[PDB]
Structure formats: structure tokens, C-alpha cells
Design a protein around this ligand. Structure first.
Ligand SMILES: CCCCCCCCCCCCCCCCCC(=O)OC[C@H](COP(=O)(O)OCCN)OC(=O)CCCCCCCCCCCCCCCCC
Ligand SMILES: CCCCCCCCCCCCCCCCCC(=O)OC[C@H](COP(=O)(O)OCCN)OC(=O)CCCCCCCCCCCCCCCCC
Ligand SMILES: CCCCCCCCCCCCCCCCCC(=O)OC[C@H](COP(=O)(O)OCCN)OC(=O)CCCCCCCCCCCCCCCCC
Ligand SMILES: CCCCCCCCCCCCCCCCCCCC
Ligand SMILES: CCCCCCCCCCCCCCCCCCCC
Ligand SMILES: CCCCCCCCCCCCCCCCCCCC
Lengths: 54, 480, 101, 162, 100
């Protein structure tokens, strides 16, 4: 039962999480200028809302 | 105020670079000569770099209501001038293959260097806005210098529209800040507040829109999506300039803005910048995990490294070594990016027309270009914060600054992002040392190789002995 | 005041009567009577006009306050006009302003 | 000057709203020229006489002359986009509408909480602007000349014919 | 007796209308139109701020803003002309080759 090294697998789990997160973030680099402007507007809204809350 | 001959002595690199712009333009008007105009541009940039000595002998004082010249301005002027000189040196062999006019490149590089000098000496919202624009517009021209190439035209269009949007965001932010305050100087952005009322709503909104524009110009998340496309589509010397000089100058003027403003120690801006720095580090490292092109990989690298710089910036008021950490990190990152983008530019030169693909194909580089492979892997180690390299000294400075101010989330983010960077930087290095399936000779190509070799030797030597760099950064201290 | 508001009302009546006169002329013309890719040189010259026009606005702002700015302002505007003429010489000498090649 | 300011602002808002939704490029440019004249009237209402003069001289007399020049150079008769009308369908424009409405709400909430003594509208002449332009703002003028030179060189290099 | 808040609100309305026009229109010329609207709204906001404080600084930065606007419109229309020359359409969704 242990020959597959379960502790090594559980410590390699963060590498798989990082790979999945990198793929999910790279989905947002679609190359569309309208999406880039929309993301800048979204970030402006987010920054302003955070500054108004705090 | 007014203008003095002593103020003219403190004006020396700006005047020298502007005179070089006029001289090179008149020389192009006389006769289009590539070698002569490139020589005139590098002579003017070296003259400004030498006149930094006379600026230092003149002292530190306020040349205009707009400009303030001190040691910090000298250091960042020197960094921007070195980046511009390296850009010219890498650009000459690339421009040897360009069928259209090769002479406007150096004119635009000189004008962008002038904007970088203005940003280094900026002490005002007017000078900051003008320096940002004076960096951006020649970069619009340089990114799309090969407009017949489709990728470069795409990068130029994306950069132009997005940076016009960011400049308008920054302008509206300065408008709200000036409406709240009434003074445009850096020292008075929140001076008319008191008794714990530093979190003025209109001032916070104006600084937020300014943060939007500057975080575009610094590739900070979520204003970061332009960076890999513009870095890939642009010519490789343009990628060198855009990665080094623009980022260094804009971060320096952001450093002065957050040091001199009485609203720079507001907790809301501090938390917003902490969120942006955390997201920038993590996202820029995660998106470079599965990148096969070196330009997009270096763009995500720039995102992560500007996140590290922002972490060093957040602890400005709490800590005392934050500016010196930023200076050491910026010198190390400048040399590492100069070497990496110089290897890219030397292996992508001459420009073989707008039809042939500009793919790098870094695998197996050692077996036909061994010295470039050694320089490139030294840069890849240096960007990873691995010791024997100056990039490790910068990472150590960022970690020490974060530990001093108890920014533990940022310290953990720095460590996690450093591990992810270790993965992809080391993958690039071992791919350089693998085996490839299949596999210039002028003195300017040799000069570019000498530049990247000197950068590699500087990175190694100041990684094993960083005390001269620490001393000459601590000598460059702005007015308190 | 009285003279200033009178001049403002006179200018307003000037605008109103001019617009009404042109509109009435066109209405009378309509009612009366029985019934039955360019080259890049145009962009280049318009762009040159725009750039030299904003540099002209800088010179407009300087010209109305020459005596209050002194010889220092003359030196600064001389540098400005020298850069203007260097740009103009650069444009002419490379054939940008030549309509025919 | 109060009634002039509000009517010019309303006209500018309505003309800009017509600009961002129109499909004909020349009609959109005409509405934006109307908006620029309205914003110049706003400038004249607030005493910024030089700013309004340059708004009609340069913004509504040079830059969109260049825009109309480019539009008639391209002979844009509404091809391959006027046949679509994609931005008028809800699924394209409602999302950015909420984005801009939220940003406007946040900026308005920030604006309403500032010290406001009112604008007296005292006319700031172009002589004072020229004095400040060549006094405390010398390097701004020189580096703005360099900036316009850079834009000239860039636009010449990109917009050639060959 | 014109409030500063009203002028700033008008400028913010024009800025967000320009941003909406920049986002929702795929035509590159309408995006350049939106960029002109946003930078003119920023310049108007600065003029309002300078007129409230009774300073020429607002008009000076208005001048710098429109210098930037003129040069940016020049570069943007040159890039638009080049795009229409080499691909005959102004739809920017075609110009999306770099991704990932
Ligand atoms: C016991 C708990 C308490 C103590 C915790 C101590 C933490 C620090 C020390 C342990 C670090 C663990 C790192 C685990 C991953 C090691 C790297 C690895 O697995 O590399 C191999 C893999 C590439 O090979 P392959 O599997 O083929 O991937 C296909 C990709 N082409 O590489 C990849 O796929 C790259 C994946 C991204 C980079 C590696 C993952 C980094 C994650 C952050 C590490 C820092 C620690 C964060 C906290 C961990 C949890 C506490
Ligand atoms: C101050 C900076 C400028 C210094 C003076 C420059 C004088 C003109 C320089 C020159 O060489 O002018 C000759 C030029 C010839 O005409 P062009 O068609 O440009 O020639 C192509 C091939 N001969 O003809 C021209 O350039 C036409 C005249 C342009 C004058 C511009 C302003 C010059 C300064 C007054
Ligand atoms: C009637 C229904 C609507 C009809 C269509 C729209 C027509 C235009 C309406 C708006 C503009 C004109 C408003 C009326 C102005 C009349 C004069 C006036 O009120 O002047 C006051 C002030 C004078 O200056 P000041 O010295 O401060 O005066 C204080 C007095 N001691 O004045 C000032 O300070 C400046 C006054 C405004 C600036 C000059 C006029 C600008 C006009 C811009 C037009 C834009 C295009 C409109 C297109 C409409 C159709 C779409
Ligand atoms: C930071 C310390 C130095 C890091 C490395 C810098 C580059 C040194 C390059 C020297 C030459 C390397 C030769 C490798 C040959 C591999 C052959 C493998 C055969 C199976
Ligand atoms: C993905 C990166 C995660 C970094 C975690 C860092 C945790 C720091 C915890 C600090 C707690 C401070 C309490 C006072
Ligand atoms: C073919 C590619 C087309 C890309 C179109 C991109 C359109 C983006 C629209 C974004 C809409 C956001 C709406 C508001 C979201 C919630 C508020 C902001 C985040 C907190």
C-alpha cells in the first residue's frame, strides 16, 4: 500500500495546484484588446471600491 | 521659481540628451547614415552619463517647481542611460537587416531616455505625467518599428490603445487629487489634511486612478495583461528597453511620489498596494509555468519582479532601508534583464524581414553559441534569486525590508513565487544546455556580446561581493 | 455691470440673428420653387498641421506675455522655435512635405 | 454663466452618449465635435478662456479634422460592422454598462465628499497662463515640444505609403 | 457660484462614457474616438480643478493633456491606417494572434 509513496504524493499536491492555477490564469491572456481594456476597467473599479471601503 | 546657471549644471543630462536629439535629427536631415547617427546617439548618451559627475559635484537642489535633482535622481538617471545605451548597442545589429529607415530608432530611443531622465528628476504631477508620456510615445513607435511584421503591428496597436487608456486614467486621477489638494507638488498631496483625516475620499480616488495608470505602466496585476503580447511582438532591443528603462523610471518616480506625499503613509493605499503586490507576484510566477516562448516568459518574469519591488515599496514609511533595497534590486534586475534580452536580441539579429518568423529556439544554444548560453543561464539564475548572483542580493533586500515591517503575507508570497520562478527559470537554463536537432561577424555584434558578457560578470561579481553596489546605492539618497 | 452685460446681450443677439438668417434662407430655398482610397500624403499633411498647431498654441501663449517674461522667456522660446525649425528641416529634407516624390 | 454651464454640460453629455452608440463614423465625429464645442462653452463659463479657445482651435479644429481626414481617406461607408450592429444587442453592452455605472457611482461618491466653496468663475486670461507656462513650467514646455516631435516622427514612420 | 462637485461629476460622466465607448466598440476608430473622449474628460476635470482654486495650473495641464491627445491621435490614426492597409478591416478581434 505504501510503495507508491503517499507522503511524496501529498507533498507533490502543491505542484499540481500551482500548475492548475497557472493554466486558469493563462486562460485570461486571450489576446483580445477589448478584454484587456475591460480588465483594466475592472481593476480600476476594484481598486476604487477597496479604497472607498477602507 | 526661475532658472539659474547652477540649475543649468544640475540640468546637464536632460540638456545633453535633448541636444543629442536635435543633433541626430539634423544629421538625419543632412544624410541618412546609420553608423553616424547611431554613433552620435551613443556619444550623447555617454556624454550624459559622464555629466552625471558634474551634476553630483553641483549638489542636490530643486531645478524648477517641477524638477528636483539629488543622488536618487542621479542613480536612476544612470540606470535609464545605461539601459538606453544597451538598447542602442543591441539595436544596431538588429537594424542592419531592416529594409526601411534605420535612423528614427535612435531618435526615439533618445527621446524615451529623455523622458526617463525627467521621470528620475520629477517632483511634480506635471513632470510625472510628461515623463510617463515621453517614455510611452517613443515606445509606441519602437514597439511597432517593424510595422510590416504582423506581430509587431499587433503589439504596437495593443500598447498604444492600452497606454492611452492608462494615461487618461492617470490624468483623471491627478485631476481629482488637484481638486482635493490645490497644489501639484509631491510634498503637498495631502498636506492640507490633519487630525487623522488623511483618508480623504476624493484624494483616495485620485490616487487610486493614478495607481491604475502606474500599475499599467509597471505591469502590476490586474493591469498586467498587455505585458507578454507587447514583449513578444516588439523587436528584441525594444523589448530590452521596455523591460528595463521604462519600468525603472516609472518605479523611481512612484518611489518619490510615495516618499514625498503626506498621503503615502495612508493605510488604505498600503493595503491596496499589498493586495496588488501579492497578486502580482503570485500571478506573474504562475503564468510563466508553461511558457515556451522566451519573450512572454520574461514578461511574466517582469510582472513578478515588479511585484517584489512593490513589496519593497510598501514598507517605505515603516522601514528605513526600503529605498536602498529598491536601488540594489533595480541595479540587479537591470543587469539581469539586460543580459537576457541582449542574448535574445543577439540571437534574433539581423532582422530577417517581416515574413520570416522570429522564433528564438533557445534549446541547444550551448553547442553553437557557448558564451551566449553561459551569459543567458547566468541571467536565468540571477532572475531566480539564486546566490552568486546580484538578483539574490535584491531578493534578500526585499525579504529583509518585508521582515522589518512585518509584512508576512508579502514575505510568504515572495517565497512561493520565488519557488515557481526557480522552476521555470531552471527549465529555461537546462533547455539551453540540452541537445538541438539542427543548427553578423561585425564589431557591433561583438559589442553587444561584450555588453552581455560584462553584465554577466557584474552579476556574478556583485553577487559574490555586493558591498560596492550597496555603498554606491546608499551614497544616492534623496532629500528627506 | 451694464456695459459688459449689454455687450454680452449684443453678442447673443448677433449669434441668434445669424443662425436664424441662415436657417430662414435655407427654409425659403426649400419651400419656394416648383419641382419636377486616397494616398497617405493627406494624413501626413493633416498630422503635421495638428502637431505644428499645438506647438503654435505654445507660441500663442508666449506671445501675449512677452514683456512680463523677460529675456529668460525669450531664450526658452528661442530653444522651442529652434526645435520647431529642426523638426521642420527634418520633415522637409526627407521628402515628407514634398507632395510629389 | 450658471445656466450656460449646465446647458453646455447637458449638451456635451448627450452628444457623447450619441457618439458611443452611433454607427455612422461621420455622424459620430459630428456629434463629438458638438460635444467639444459644448465642453469649450463649459470652459468659457468657468473663466478658463484659454482652455476653451484651444478646445475649439485644437481639439475641435485640428485633431478631429485629422479624424475626418482619416475617415474620408478610408471611405468608411459602414461595411462589415454596420451589417452587424453587435454593440446594440444587450449581450455585448450591458456588462460594460454595469462596469461604467459602478465606476461612476464610486467616483461620484468620492466627489460628493470634498470641501466645496464653489467656483467663482473669475476669468483667468491667457496672459497669466503664458506667464506661468514660461515661468514655473519651462521644462514642461521644452519636453512637451520634444514629446510632440516624438509623436511626429512616430506617425510619419508608421503612416507612410511606400 | 458653480459648485466644484458638479463640474467634477460632469467630467466623470464624460470619462465613463468614453470608457464605455472604448470597450463596447470593436471598430478601432471608435476606440480612438473613445480615447479622445476620456482624455478630454480628464482635461476638463483638471480645468475645473484649476478654476476652483483660481490657478493657471489647470490650464497648463490642460495644454499638456491636449498635446498628449494630439500626438496620441496621430500615432493611433497612423496605426489604424497601417491596419487598414495590410488587412483591409478595422475589427481588432482579428488582431489577436499573441495569446496564452
Ligand atoms: C509538510 C508541510 C510543512 C512543511 C512545508 C515545507 C515547504 C517547502 C519545502 C517543500 C517544497 C515542496 C515543493 C513541491 C513541488 C516540487 C517541484 C516539482 O514537483 O517539480 C516537478 C514538476 C515538473 O515535472 P512534472 O511532474 O513532469 O511536471 C510536468 C510539467 N511539464 O514541477 C512542476 O510541475 C512545477 C510546479 C510549480 C513549482 C513547484 C511548486 C511550488 C509550490 C510552492 C512551494 C513553496 C512552499 C509553499 C507551502 C507548501 C505547503 C505547506
Ligand atoms: C534652425 C535649424 C535649421 C538650420 C537651417 C537649415 C536650412 C535648410 C537646410 C537645407 O539643407 O535646406 C535645403 C533643402 C533642399 O530641399 P529638399 O527638397 O529638402 O532637398 C532634397 C535633396 N536636396 O531645402 C529646405 O530644407 C527648404 C527650406 C526649409 C527651411 C526650414 C527652416 C530653416 C531655418 C530658418
Ligand atoms: C435655448 C435652448 C437650447 C438651444 C440649443 C443650444 C444652444 C446653446 C446653449 C448653450 C450655450 C449658450 C448659453 C447662453 C449664454 C448667454 C450669455 C450668458 O449667459 O453669458 C454669461 C457668461 C458671461 O461671462 P461673465 O462675465 O462670467 O458673466 C457674468 C455677468 N457679470 O457667459 C460665460 O461665461 C460663457 C457663456 C457660454 C460660452 C459661450 C457659448 C458657447 C456655445 C457652445 C455651443 C455648443 C454647440 C451646441 C449645439 C446645440 C445642438 C446640439
Ligand atoms: C552561478 C555560477 C555559474 C553557473 C553556470 C554559468 C555558465 C557556465 C558554463 C560553462 C560551460 C558548461 C558546459 C556544460 C557541458 C555539458 C555537457 C554534458 C554532456 C553529457
Ligand atoms: C500563496 C502564498 C501564501 C502565503 C501565506 C503567508 C502567510 C502569512 C501569515 C501571517 C500571519 C500574521 C498574523 C499576525
Ligand atoms: C471575443 C472576445 C470578446 C471579449 C469581450 C470582453 C467583455 C468583458 C465584459 C466584462 C463585464 C464585467 C461586468 C461586471 C462584473 C462585476 C463587477 C467587476 C468585478 C468585481
Amino acid at each position: 500500500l505504501l510503495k507508491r509513496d503517499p507522503l511524496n504524493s501529498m507533498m507533490n499536491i502543491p505542484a499540481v495546484l500551482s500548475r492548475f492555477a497557472g493554466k486558469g490564469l493563462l486562460l485570461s491572456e486571450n489576446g483580445y484588446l477589448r478584454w484587456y481594456v475591460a480588465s483594466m476597467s475592472i481593476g480600476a473599479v476594484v481598486v476604487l471600491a477597496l479604497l472607498m471601503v477602507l | 521659481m526661475t532658472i539659474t546657471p547652477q540649475n543649468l549644471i544640475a540640468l546637464l543630462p536632460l540638456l545633453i540628451v535633448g541636444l543629442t536629439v536635435v543633433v541626430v535629427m539634423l544629421s538625419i536631415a543632412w544624410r541618412r547614415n546609420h553608423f553616424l547617427n547611431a554613433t552620435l546617439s551613443v556619444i550623447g548618451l555617454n556624454a550624459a552619463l559622464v555629466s552625471l559627475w558634474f551634476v553630483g559635484q553641483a549638489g542636490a537642489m530643486d531645478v524648477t517647481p517641477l524638477m528636483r535633482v539629488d543622488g536618487f535622481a542621479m542613480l536612476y538617471t544612470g540606470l535609464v542611460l545605461l539601459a538606453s545605451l544597451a538598447t542602442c548597442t543591441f539595436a544596431y545589429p538588429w537594424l542592419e537587416g531592416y529594409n526601411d529607415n534605420k535612423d528614427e530608432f535612435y531618435l526615439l530611443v533618445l527621446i524615451a531616455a529623455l523622458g526617463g531622465i525627467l521621470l528620475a528628476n520629477a517632483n511634480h504631477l506635471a513632470s510625472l505625467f510628461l515623463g510617463i508620456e515621453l517614455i510611452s510615445l517613443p515606445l509606441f513607435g519602437l514597439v511597432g518599428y517593424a510595422f510590416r511584421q504582423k506581430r509587431s503591428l499587433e503589439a504596437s496597436i495593443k500598447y498604444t490603445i492600452l497606454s492611452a487608456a492608462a494615461s487618461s486614467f492617470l490624468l483623471f486621477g491627478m485631476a481629482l487629487v488637484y481638486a482635493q489638494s490645490g497644489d501639484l507638488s509631491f510634498v503637498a498631496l495631502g498636506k492640507n489634511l490633519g487630525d487623522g483625516m488623511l483618508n480623504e475620499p476624493l484624494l483616495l480616488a485620485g490616487f487610486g486612478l493614478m495607481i491604475v495608470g502606474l500599475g499599467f505602466k509597471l505591469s502590476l496585476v490586474p493591469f498586467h495583461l498587455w505585458t507578454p503580447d507587447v514583449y513578444q511582438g516588439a523587436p528584441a532591443p525594444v523589448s530590452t528597453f521596455l523591460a528595463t528603462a521604462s519600468k525603472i523610471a516609472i518605479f523611481g518616480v512612484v518611489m518619490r511620489l510615495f516618499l514625498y506625499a503626506p498621503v503615502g503613509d495612508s493605510e488604505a493605499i498600503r493595503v491596496v498596494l499589498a493586495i496588488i503586490a501579492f497578486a502580482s507576484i503570485i500571478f506573474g510566477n504562475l503564468m510563466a509555468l508553461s511558457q515556451t516562448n522566451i519573450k512572454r516568459l520574461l514578461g511574466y518574469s517582469s510582472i513578478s519582479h515588479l511585484g517584489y519591488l512593490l513589496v519593497a515599496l510598501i514598507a517605505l514609511q515603516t522601514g528605513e532601508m526600503s529605498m536602498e533595497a529598491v536601488g540594489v534590486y533595480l541595479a540587479g534586475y537591470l543587469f539581469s534583464s539586460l543580459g537576457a534580452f541582449g542574448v535574445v536580441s543577439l540571437m534574433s539579429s539581423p532582422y530577417r524581414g517581416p515574413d520570416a518568423d522570429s522564433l528564438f529556439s533557445y534549446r541547444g544554444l550551448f553547442w553553437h553559441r557557448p558564451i551566449l548560453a553561459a551569459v543567458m543561464t547566468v541571467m536565468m539564475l540571477s532572475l531566480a534569486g539564486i546566490p552568486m548572483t546580484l538578483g539574490f542580493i535584491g531578493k534578500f533586500y526585499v525579504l529583509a525590508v518585508g521582515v522589518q515591517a512585518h509584512l508576512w503575507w508579502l514575505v510568504g508570497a515572495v517565497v512561493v513565487g520565488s519557488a515557481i520562478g526557480l522552476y521555470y527559470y531552471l527549465r529555461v537554463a537546462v533547455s539551453l544546455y540540452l541537445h538541438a536537432p539542427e543548427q553578423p561577424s561585425n564589431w557591433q555584434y561583438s559589442a553587444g556580446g561584450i555588453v552581455v558578457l560584462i553584465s554577466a560578470l557584474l552579476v556574478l561579481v556583485l553577487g559574490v561581493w555586493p558591498q560596492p553596489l550597496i555603498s554606491i546605492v546608499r551614497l544616492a539618497m534623496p532629500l528627506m | 455691470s451694464t456695459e459688459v452685460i449689454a455687450h454680452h446681450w449684443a453678442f447673443a443677439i448677433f449669434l441668434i440673428v445669424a443662425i436664424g438668417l441662415c436657417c430662414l434662407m435655407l427654409v425659403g430655398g426649400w419651400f419656394l420653387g416648383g419641382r419636377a482610397r486616397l494616398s497617405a500624403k493627406f494624413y501626413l499633411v493633416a498630422m503635421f498641421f495638428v502637431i505644428f498647431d499645438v506647438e503654435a498654441l505654445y507660441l500663442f501663449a508666449w506671445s501675449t506675455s512677452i514683456r512680463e517674461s523677460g529675456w529668460v522667456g525669450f531664450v526658452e522660446a528661442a530653444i522651442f522655435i529652434f526645435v520647431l525649425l529642426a523638426g521642420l528641416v527634418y520633415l522637409v529634407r526627407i521628402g515628407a512635405l514634398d507632395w510629389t516624390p | 454663466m450658471e445656466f450656460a454651464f449646465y446647458i453646455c454640460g447637458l449638451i456635451a453629455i448627450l452628444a457623447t452618449l450619441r457618439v458611443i452608440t452611433h454607427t455612422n463614423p461621420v455622424h459620430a465625429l459630428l456629434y463629438l465635435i458638438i460635444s467639444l464645442l459644448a465642453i469649450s462653452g463649459v470652459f468659457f463659463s468657468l473663466g478658463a478662456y484659454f482652455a476653451g479657445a484651444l478646445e475649439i482651435i485644437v481639439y475641435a479644429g485640428a485633431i478631429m479634422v485629422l479624424f475626418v481626414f482619416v475617415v474620408m481617406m478610408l471611405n468608411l461607408g459602414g461595411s462589415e460592422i454596420e451589417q452587424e450592429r453587435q454593440w446594440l444587442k444587450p449581450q455585448v453592452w450591458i456588462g460594460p454598462a454595469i462596469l461604467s455605472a459602478i465606476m461612476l457611482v464610486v467616483i461620484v461618491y468620492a466627489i460628493l465628499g470634498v470641501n466645496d466653496q464653489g467656483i467663482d468663475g473669475t476669468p483667468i486670461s491667457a496672459k497669466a497662463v503664458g506667464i506661468t507656462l514660461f515661468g514655473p513650467y519651462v521644462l514642461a514646455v521644452e519636453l512637451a515640444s520634444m514629446l510632440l516631435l516624438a509623436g511626429l516622427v512616430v506617425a510619419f514612420h508608421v503612416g507612410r505609403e511606400e | 457660484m458653480i459648485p466644484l462637485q458638479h463640474g467634477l461629476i460632469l467630467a466623470a460622466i464624460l470619462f465613463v462614457l468614453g470608457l464605455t465607448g472604448l470597450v463596447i466598440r470593436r471598430n478601432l476608430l471608435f476606440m480612438l474616438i473613445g480615447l479622445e473622449i476620456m482624455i478630454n474628460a480628464s482635461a476638463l476635470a483638471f480645468v475645473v480643478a484649476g478654476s476652483y482654486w483660481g490657478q493657471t495650473d489647470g490650464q497648463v495641464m490642460y495644454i499638456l493633456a491636449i498635446s498628449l491627445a494630439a500626438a496620441e491621435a496621430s500615432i493611433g490614426l497612423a496605426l489604424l491606417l497601417q491596419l487598414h492597409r495590410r488587412r483591409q478591416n478595422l475589427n481588432i478581434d482579428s488582431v489577436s494572434e499573441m495569446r496564452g
